[PDB]
Amino acid sequence: NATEIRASVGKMIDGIGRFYIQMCTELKLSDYEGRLIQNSLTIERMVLSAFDERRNKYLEEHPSAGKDPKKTGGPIYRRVDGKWRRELILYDKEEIRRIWRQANNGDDATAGLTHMMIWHSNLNDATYQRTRALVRTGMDPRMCSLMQGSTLPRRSGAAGAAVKGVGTMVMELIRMIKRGINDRNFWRGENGRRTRIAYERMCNILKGKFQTAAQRTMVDQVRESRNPGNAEFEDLIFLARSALILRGSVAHKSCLPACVYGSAVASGYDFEREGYSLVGIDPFRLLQNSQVYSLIRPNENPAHKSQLVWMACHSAAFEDLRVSSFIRGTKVVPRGKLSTRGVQIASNENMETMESSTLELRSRYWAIRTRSGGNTNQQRASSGQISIQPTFSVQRNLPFDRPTIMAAFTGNTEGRTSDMRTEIIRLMESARPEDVSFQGRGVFELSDEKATSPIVPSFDMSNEGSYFFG
Amino acid sequence: NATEIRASVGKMIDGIGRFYIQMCTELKLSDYEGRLIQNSLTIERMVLSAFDERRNKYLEEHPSAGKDPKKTGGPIYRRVDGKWRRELILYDKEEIRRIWRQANNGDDATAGLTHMMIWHSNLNDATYQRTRALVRTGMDPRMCSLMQGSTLPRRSGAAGAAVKGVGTMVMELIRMIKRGINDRNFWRGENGRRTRIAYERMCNILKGKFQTAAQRTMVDQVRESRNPGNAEFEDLIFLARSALILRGSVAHKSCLPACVYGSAVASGYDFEREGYSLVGIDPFRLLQNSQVYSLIRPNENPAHKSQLVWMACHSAAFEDLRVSSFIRGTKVVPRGKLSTRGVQIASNENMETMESSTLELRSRYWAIRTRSGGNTNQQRGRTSDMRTEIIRLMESARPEDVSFQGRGVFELSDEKATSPIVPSFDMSNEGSYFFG
């Protein structure tokens, strides 16, 4: 059944919106100031810093960074008669802990935490990607497309684990492998057992993320190595560059600004009654009647800022630019010529230059965002009969495809990497930049609610560039 | 004696044909509409839904799917002056239960049920095979050839059990093994005892299906595991890939469209008097003078549709294409380039595009279809030790060994199996593989 999931997510987002309402009440902010992305961003880093129970425990025993008992940051932006001023207001965690507890009807609301931290990961992926760490581990900077959910820490649950990219897991596992290579950390102690456990948990997350059997089997065999040394490093680099084309089925969770939920809840649009969804039309129509204000530099233009905000909201920064333009209806400028900077404001930037203005989020169309893969990346081995059965009793040969019959019969010793790299190469050669994917699905219009009739898009606009970076 | 079996099957098919006659009388259909495969198909799903006593009991306690007290589906296709229209006419089970009871002279006619459900399994195997479930259990999609009788549920008897393929049994047993692995279901309760019983019944069906002693012995030893866990999974996968070449002696029951029997019975050809057979010339000669109409899409061609219908009728979709072409006399196109779709029509397809036309079922020759294996097999502690002999037998096996010595393809004019003609194909590598 799907009604229960819809009711649960509706209750969750209703609690989130009511917490936004109460923060607006408590902060004594104006109507316009309640529609600012920066305030929600700072408040949500406060949120994560209050539920980072592991870091809370680590910092209680580590009283450093000067005045840091329980309070961090808090750069609240406020308006005086047109001008803007930032105040470093410090909030302790504990009162906000109870205000959450009262906001979700006595519950912890950790799922909502996962969605906000994923949405921060989405905005981070949209704004800046780290080739710095990608080459710190030595991997080439060609794979920036697989840094989805990179900023997400381990503390997130299965829902958070679903949206993390393959490359994010590759980076996380290489970190552990390098740490275990630097020092003899895999001893029979509890630390070794726990890092072992986290390792197989991350690995079965990985093998769940993939779709074709060959990569699942080679991930299974990578596990066989009880002592991760150097060979597994290139083994999993080969895994990553195979997933470049044999991409994993990674979900795309549609989270929206802290305000958008608050404005919707304040108007009385209860999500429990009519139901809510995270993949369907829902986050699209809530943005159809949502007003958002944002802060812009004197050199920054708002036109690219709105598009980057739409990137962050719908996590479409790693998608084809042409498709995003089609749903937008307007051309989406790649990051090469974006005359804008990061959404977050540096702590040293002055305030006389800063100017607030609206953001455009309206899109002409809407589409479903499933956690599936392309329908043109399944070119491996073969598909058909191997044996025959005699139906008529006729004196005839029984055709047997012998060379594949030996291939099926082996020993299953669960040990090999290059031998499967051979099928990786074969499949890559079979792959083409022409194979059309997602057959049977299309882009839909806003006026339709039950997915009745789509329109098939068709682009012949040469080589405008389907590459957000470079 | 064989006369009694012939008389029994003749009486059964006579009752089936008379039931077809009475449904034609009751439905007020025209002569052409009585020769449509779709009507018989829908009526026979009604048939199975009326004798699915287990599902009847399960659905009486489960009133769901909206308006479903006793009536399901019923998309009857009718002609108005050339055009076609579907009506969703709902029939309850019980009256058709009594009409059967009167159609078989007071008997239940469960054997006929088995043959119709097998014929549905034959058409399903001809049209679509499920690698979906084959990889849901994780088995590779290379073994689509052993999905014979896959759609057949357990309710069929020994006659139904004979025609189910080895791979069908492998899938059914792996389903039970995975269910017993997910939860501790093998307790000393009645459910565990009954699933145990069904397990040995399916297993001695399996060991009866095989021919060589090694696989029979390893199936015997697979039984010795009182707690089916993970090792038996690969054990029986090895059994399956051994049966790929060491094939089991599975029968091929020759059932024909619901109409073909009805037209034959209506003309007065009593099968009890002259006798009837399910393996011999009989279903061949009844199709020699049978007229069949079918529904075809505006893009579908009837030429491949007739060949696919012959596949479904004679269950030759898993055989060599060359042999089927020889009996046909015309080339049989493999499924790779069939510009056609499934025989059954989707519930949402429009009717202005649909067009009805004849089907060709005439074949130049006829052959016996025994439940034997290739002559190549006659020419030739745990499970792994026997896997060793499996491997050496596989190595001894060759793609050259000719089978079925002493038997041949026959002509239509002969009735007593007097003199055959030996076929000989040297036409390179046209492709003896229906899939791929």
Add this chain to the structure above:
Amino acid sequence: NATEIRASVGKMIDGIGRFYIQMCTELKLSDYEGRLIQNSLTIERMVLSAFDERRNKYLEEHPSAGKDPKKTGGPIYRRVDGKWRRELILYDKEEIRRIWRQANNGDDATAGLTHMMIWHSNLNDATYQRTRALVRTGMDPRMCSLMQGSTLPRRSGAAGAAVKGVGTMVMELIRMIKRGINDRNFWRGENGRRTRIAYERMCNILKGKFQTAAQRTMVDQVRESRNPGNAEFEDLIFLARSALILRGSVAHKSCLPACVYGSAVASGYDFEREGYSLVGIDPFRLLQNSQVYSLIRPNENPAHKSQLVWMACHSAAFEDLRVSSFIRGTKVVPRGKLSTRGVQIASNENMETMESSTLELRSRYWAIRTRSGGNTNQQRGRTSDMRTEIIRLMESARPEDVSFQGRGVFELSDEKATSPIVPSFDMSNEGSYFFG
């Protein structure tokens, strides 16, 4: 080096004796009342009930048994002018926890806990053995000799694990096996993982306890069963009846009454300076000048009570009676004709009949008690194949093979193990069997 171990055990027993001194100070008992075994026994059950942190946690969530917040029992026996009276004085755990903490110089003193709980196990084995549980698991009552350390719970450490008998481990493992057979308890959850872990810990304790390679290998192979069912039950019963003769190298820890340590510490005999040992002459010479008073029934005789107390102190209740008589110098009466009862007094017994008197602990000789096996062993796919060598070794075994070559019984006057005297018994069949 052995000096560090001697210093550690000396410090431990010094702390124990000082705790005895302080309890004597706090309880306001007389000099005679401080030499009573019953008071020390009750105080030491208080000790175990205060460090049973597992049971403390289990009872804090389970407030039952009426008035049981933190206090249990406490039947202190006191003298009025010759007569005796018991008072049910209740002591809470926590203050005694801190008094221990101050008694061991800020340390927990868990090792001392292990030795006191082992000494309770020694007295329990000396007094009463449970064929009740031995036949509750169905094992025959012939193996009462392998119930050493049976009362010891799991909470003890490696030192406690060393002295537990083979049969005690057999009983503990069969309990877990029967619990896992009754319900599907071996799931992938944390409980299954932890019981698994405890299982291999108890099993490598077992295989460490044995000496011959065959039984170690069969214990190794018993481990290979991931699902302990019924076959392992008889497998480990065969292991036990093989250990009947192929006995395991189990230690014998020489703990002494709560008072004996207190009297020695009170007199100023510091054990840290001169060193202390648990296997050598030490516990023998401390009893050479120790006075002990005990409570005796009007029908009980003190002569057998002193011998039973010596059994409990030196854990010689499972040894040959002849040898114990030789070290005693007087005949040791077997349990068949002991006109005495258990040392502990029932909660309902009256006090007018109870009479206090001295106990004799002096022994003419002393001997080393190593954790080795008889020299007879040095003279000599599944479980059944190794059971074959078990049977042939049993047949090779004889009731004549003399053991412990090169070692002998020593005199008290010698301190450095200079010259022993070889004993020799030809006194027919007096009976080398404490039970029966």
Add this chain to the structure above:
Amino acid sequence: NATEIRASVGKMIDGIGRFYIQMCTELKLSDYEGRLIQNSLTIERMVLSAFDERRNKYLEEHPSAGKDPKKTGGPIYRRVDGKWRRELILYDKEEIRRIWRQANNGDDATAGLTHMMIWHSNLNDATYQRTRALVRTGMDPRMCSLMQGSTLPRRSGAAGAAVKGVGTMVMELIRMIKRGINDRNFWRGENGRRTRIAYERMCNILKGKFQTAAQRTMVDQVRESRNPGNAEFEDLIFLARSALILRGSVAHKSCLPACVYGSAVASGYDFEREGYSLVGIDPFRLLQNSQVYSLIRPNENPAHKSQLVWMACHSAAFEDLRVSSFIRGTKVVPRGKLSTRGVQIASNENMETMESSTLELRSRYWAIRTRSGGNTNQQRASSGQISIQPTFSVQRNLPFDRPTIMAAFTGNTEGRTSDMRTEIIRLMESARPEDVSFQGRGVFELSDEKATSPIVPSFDMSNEGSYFFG
């Protein structure tokens, strides 16, 4: 816990007593006629004939015995001004079925059925025992003492199965064995499977009933025979004559007349509140203030009739006469010189001779009736150590009891009967007619309620005869 069992049995007997009250209301009987055993006896055969669902199904397809649609018997005895008259009033089952259903608050009350049918078995065992069938199977008439619960049919549950004697099970199993010998009835059909199942159910009931390991093991090995022929017949006869001395732990359920419960319930003594027990003081004190009237022949004396009724009530007809006399306080006459007949009245006996009078049920003492065995029938094998452990390191022999060491080491082939008959004979020879049993337990006085202090009985009255038959 024992409170729940007490509450359940109290509710059950309260329902039984209320059904007795309603039958007294419906039958229009007088106060004296409601204290007659015969009326309750006939009504309770009506009870069993109404819940004998198996026989109901068998007789619906078998309309014989003349007028027998739903009604059987019903010889109700009534008083006219001192004289007595029997009326053959026929009651159908179904209305009494619903009256039960309303009497137990909507429940079937099958447990109460088991207790009434056991109490009928108790009275039958007290009155008449069948050496007729005992020699029909050919077994000697010396074992009449093991016919406890003989009349009980299979339909009773575990509670009914507990009180059936060892000899009753022997007779029931020999019946099945002779039936399977007469015809090839053990085929692979459903009938063979079901009789097989009933066979192991009766056999594990048997092995649960015994106490010593040898007989349990030989019962286990008797099971090994898949085809019960002739050898098992003498095998289980040997089992029976071994159980003659190695008696099985068979319970003694204390059921009382149909009226006694009704009179107690009518007076308002609710058993749910104060609790009820079936083994303790309870059935004793209810008889301390119970009045019972009974029918007696002109030649029968009431003095022996009261004692026989006490036999039937407390199922002490198979016990020592001396002990029963001690609890009675008066001498109990053995069946050899009882100038009385069966309690039930023959259908042809005239009514002018029949006379009604009181029955004495008062007993001077009370005792617990546990389902245990004698503490002097445990003389088998030996008890003591077999091995020794070296405590001191002394150069000495290790005494091993070798001939028993071989005895323990065998093969466990689960096949033998005479070899264990050898230990049967050895144990029988070790057994003595002097061994005192039931140590630590004694006879109690009525005034005590919590089992405080007993008095030890002691009989030196020569050989009065501890044998009810003969």
Add this chain to the structure above:
RNA sequence: UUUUUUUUUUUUUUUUUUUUUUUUUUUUUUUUUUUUUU
């Protein structure tokens, strides 16, 4: 030179027993009565 882990109710009236356990149906029997007779 070898070591403090916790998972839903037990035990000191005492020394080898005693203890939260259950409605299945297959071809003709039985209340003249208590150990024979069919």
Add this chain to the structure above:
RNA sequence: UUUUUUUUUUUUUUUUUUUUUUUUUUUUUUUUUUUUUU
């Protein structure tokens, strides 16, 4: 001469995918900034 058993929610939009899944903590990092520098 070889045979009608029933156990808690599936399937005809279509031909080889798509679907009721979850808060763990171990010795010093990061919002001056967007792909280097430590």
